[PDB]
């Protein structure tokens, strides 16, 4: 509900400015088109492969806070698989707190901030 509440607002803002990007504007509206199309890529999902609630908040946290903005829209699907494989493999301790607490705590947010930023740095290897 923390990360999804922000996504619902930003997707609503993107939906208003939908037919504009199809065919230069100020920096404020450029951010909405940037987030909008990138958050839409996160909503895509493979069949017969449901994700856990702890795994879902991580991929939304990355997109909504603005770690995908500088990354290209084509590589968002690729980034998700690489990011999801990274956190599940090497960060089970962080996912354990999200399940138990049921909320992104002050410490868990700072911890998750470190994981996304460092992984994003050396993405295209």
């Amino acid at each position: 509900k923390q990360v999804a509440g922000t996504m619902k607002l930003e997707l609503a803002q993107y939906r208003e400015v939908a037919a504009f990007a199809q065919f230069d504007l100020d920096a404020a509206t450029q951010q909405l088109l940037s987030r909008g199309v990138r958050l839409t890529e996160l909503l895509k999902q493979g069949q017969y492969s449901p994700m856990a609630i702890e795994e879902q908040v991580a991929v939304i946290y990355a997109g909504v806070r603005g770690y995908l903005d500088k990354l290209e829209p084509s590589k968002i699907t690729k980034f998700e698989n690489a990011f999801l494989s990274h956190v599940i493999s090497q960060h089970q301790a962080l996912l354990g707190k999200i399940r138990t607490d049921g909320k992104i705590s002050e410490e868990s947010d700072a911890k998750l901030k470190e994981i996304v930023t460092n992984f994003l740095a050396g993405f295209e290897a």
């Binding site: 037919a19 504009f20 065919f23 230069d24 504007l25 100020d26």
Partner: protein, 196 residues
């Protein structure tokens, strides 16, 4: 008209309404940019002392063509298509890709160099028509852009508003036909049951 034709037509004009509605806001953004850049250009132009490719701009191209053809009696890429079939002989040179982006001094200088070798903006609704030669041409393009942008904004506004007027009519016609099909098809079933 049948119910399917009303549905297909209603969907068609809804899209044309949504496209034109967005272009009003896009034309407004380019107009807002054109107005700010024109403020120093008026000081730059008057102190010292054509149209565009993009159509759907009210009466910019017809106004220039009328005043241009008026001077025949005395003696972008769109201007040629309006002329040509009437005056192919007096053509010397032609330009293109004009009125897409705001014309800077660098791109405006390309006209001055090749030459050797306009609708003034009154308001949003109403509008009417070596180094010194680069100033007069720069003043004409900036004024023509702001006049052309405001006409697009107004033309697309009327298009979206006229489309909305037709959607309202088709919405009522759709609802009448929707009820008629429900009532008619039911009477076929009741007649079938009664016959048994």
């Amino acid at each position: 008209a049948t119910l399917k034709d009303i549905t297909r037509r209603l969907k068609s004009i809804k899209n044309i309404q949504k496209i034109t509605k967005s272009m009003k806001m896009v034309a407004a953004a380019k107009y807002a940019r054109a107005e700010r850049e024109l403020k120093p250009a008026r000081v730059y132009g008057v102190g010292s002392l054509v149209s565009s490719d993009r159509g759907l701009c009210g009466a910019i191209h017809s106004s220039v063509a009328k005043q241009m053809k008026s001077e025949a009696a005395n003696l972008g890429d769109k201007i040629r298509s309006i002329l040509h079939r009437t005056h192919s002989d007096q053509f010397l040179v032609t330009f293109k890709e004009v009125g897409r982006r705001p014309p800077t001094f660098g791109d405006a200088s390309v006209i001055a160099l090749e030459l050797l070798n306009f609708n003034r903006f009154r308001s949003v609704i109403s509008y009417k028509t070596e180094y010194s030669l680069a100033n007069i041409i720069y003043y004409s393009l900036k004024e023509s852009t702001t006049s052309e942008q405001s006409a697009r904004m107004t033309a697309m506004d009327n298009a979206s508003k006229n489309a909305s007027e037709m959607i309202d009519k088709l919405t009522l016609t759709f609802n009448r036909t929707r009820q008629a099909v429900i009532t008619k098809e039911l009477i076929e079933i009741i007649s079938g049951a009664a016959a048994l």
